[PDB]
């Protein structure tokens, strides 16, 4: 079907300025107590998640460089240690990844 007449700017504005088509304001925005950046109350912080993701990517890169094959996965647990650290009596017998970076403040030894 074809339109019978041209719709005027008045009715066009009434249509595409209705509050149903306006962008709603978000009230769930808060600051991250760690870095001070903005985040939603139900979503993880983008900055902190990017930090953790970069550290995880580096750890995985090193742990994949340790295994020269694609199908070579360790049958034991794994432990990542940073510069100036030694494997404890509970961490021995596991695969050991060694990072030259110092241990970050958010990474807990455990």
């Amino acid at each position: 079907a074809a339109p019978k007449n041209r719709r005027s700017i008045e009715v066009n504005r009434c249509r595409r300025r209705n509050p149903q088509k306006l962008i709603k304001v978000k009230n769930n925005i808060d600051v991250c107590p760690e870095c001070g950046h903005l985040k939603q109350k139900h979503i993880l912080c983008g900055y902190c998640y990017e930090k953790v993701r970069k550290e995880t990517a580096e750890i995985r890169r090193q742990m994949g460089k340790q295994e020269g094959g694609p199908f070579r996965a360790p049958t034991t647990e794994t432990v990542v240690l940073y510069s100036g650290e030694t494997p404890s009596e509970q961490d021995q017998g596991k695969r050991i990844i060694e990072r030259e970076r110092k241990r970050p403040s958010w990474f807990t030894q455990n």
Partner: protein, 246 residues
């Protein structure tokens, strides 16, 4: 249907078009200061007494051989050049240049100050209002030293003269919205400066133009600003940690 956009503004100059210029760049002045006069740290205490300051100043002007030979060079290059009536002309040029910057008279300001003095005094002020005045002068301007730079590639000599001034001015820099920014228009603050004038001696006209403004390193800090300033810290990437300096 096949159409594209135009006017992508890019500034890219190369050494080939820089050097294949048919006519060289005529410079009415040099880049900066060749021999900067380092004043003694006792100016603040010798400016309190009249005779003990003027005597030492005349001794420093007369005993240095470089300044004397430079004055002789300016004298042989251009006659009727005397150092006794020079500080009055320097003070006149200074006051008229400041009044021209007040009135926003760029033409007379270009005639007074040179191409190295104009930008440093017009750039950060072209969008503001100035209310500068001249009230008093405790110590008359004194010619400290005189230098001359002779370049034989073109055969051009530029004579620079340093003049120490103890002036009393009232400066009030306003904002582009009309609010006071720097200081009041009624406080007669005392300033001590060293104005280096310059003149092309080979030029037939050769006007005296203010070239540089030397401030001693031990000079008192400038008056505080009226507003407050936030200095941002290092903008940190996620994979970078802050390091506290001690």
């Amino acid at each position: 249907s096949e159409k594209e956009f135009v006017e992508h503004a890019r500034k890219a100059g190369l050494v080939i078009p820089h050097e294949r210029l048919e006519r060289p760049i005529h410079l009415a002045c040099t880049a900066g200061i060749f021999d900067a006069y380092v004043p003694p740290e006792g100016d603040a205490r010798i400016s309190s007494l009249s005779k003990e300051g003027l005597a030492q100043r005349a001794e420093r002007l007369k005993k240095n051989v470089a300044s004397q030979l430079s004055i002789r060079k300016i004298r042989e290059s251009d006659p009727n050049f005397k150092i006794k009536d020079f500080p009055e002309k320097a003070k006149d040029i200074f006051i008229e240049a400041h009044l021209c910057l007040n009135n926003s008279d760029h033409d007379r300001l270009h005639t007074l100050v040179t191409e190295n003095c104009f930008p440093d005094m017009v750039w950060d002020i072209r969008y503001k209002t100035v209310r500068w005045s001249f009230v008093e002068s405790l110590e008359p301007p004194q010619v400290v030293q005189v230098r001359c730079s002779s370049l034989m590639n073109q055969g051009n000599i530029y004579g620079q003269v340093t003049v120490r001034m103890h002036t009393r001015q009232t400066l009030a820099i306003y904002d582009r919205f009309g609010r006071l920014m720097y200081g009041q228009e009624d406080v007669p603050r005392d300033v001590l400066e060293y104005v280096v004038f310059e003149k092309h001696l080979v030029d037939p006209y050769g006007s005296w133009r203010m070239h540089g403004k030397i401030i001693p390193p031990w000079a008192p800090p400038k008056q505080p600003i009226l507003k407050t300033v936030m200095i941002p810290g290092p903008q940190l990437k996620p994979w970078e940690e802050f390091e506290e300096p001690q």
